[PDB]
Ligand binder design. Structure first.
Ligand code: HEM
Ligand SMILES: c1ccc2cnccc2c1
Length: 153
């Protein structure tokens, strides 16, 4: 795909529907992360120590909202420029993920939760095109992050 204007339109659309209920969708997103990889709980500063995932926690909501925002912006960048660019922000993001003990093998985990989160957010308007645009947007932005990471350690 490498994002055609229509895949990019489709990603932009599901992102607003994402963004129309942050508390819900972001709580659902974390539930999904833990179901895939239980042990991932521990790397989150606002998850460990708890039973279940808080529903009205401000840091959780801002951090998961921002994750999704980054992937949607990569998707527009891929369409428009043809590449994902490495700017300050993403290099900062590399150092911070090395800090928190993130590895390359973790990235799949957060991809599948994002895929599944979007499937439930769009409900009947889910297509394979949507699934492939988001796959692509995620995989290109994680290649860039994976790079800054190995440059911070
Ligand atoms: C392209 C995929 C990813 C994106 C866009 C992303 C983005 C972010 C952002 C925006 C933050 C917080 C920004 C800030 O407040 O400075 C962050 C922190 C964090 N990320 Fe990610 N990340 C990605 C992959 C992952 C993966 C694979 C994991 C592993 C579970 C992960 C775990 C973490 C942790 C543990 C923190 C902070 C820890 C804490 O709150 O205790 N990230 N990431
Ligand atoms: C909150 C903060 C950081 C994250 C990074 N990757 C996946 C999920 C996240 C949620």
């Amino acid at each position: 795909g490498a994002l055609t204007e229509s895949q990019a339109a489709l990603v932009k659309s599901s992102w607003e529907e994402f963004n129309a209920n942050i508390p819900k969708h972001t709580h659902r997103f974390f539930i999904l992360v833990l179901e895939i990889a239980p042990a991932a709980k521990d790397l989150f500063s606002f998850l460990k120590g708890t039973s279940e995932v808080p529903q009205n926690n401000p840091e959780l909501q801002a951090h998961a909202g921002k994750v999704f925002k980054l992937v949607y912006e990569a998707a527009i960048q891929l369409e428009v420029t043809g590449v994902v660019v490495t700017d300050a922000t993403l290099k900062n993001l590399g150092s911070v993920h090395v800090s928190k003990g993130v590895a390359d093998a973790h990235f799949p985990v957060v991809k599948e939760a994002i895929l599944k989160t979007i499937k439930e957010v769009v409900g009947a308007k889910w297509s394979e095109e949507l699934n492939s645009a988001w796959t692509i947007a995620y995989d290109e932005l994680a290649i860039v992050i994976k790079k800054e990471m190995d440059d911070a350690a």
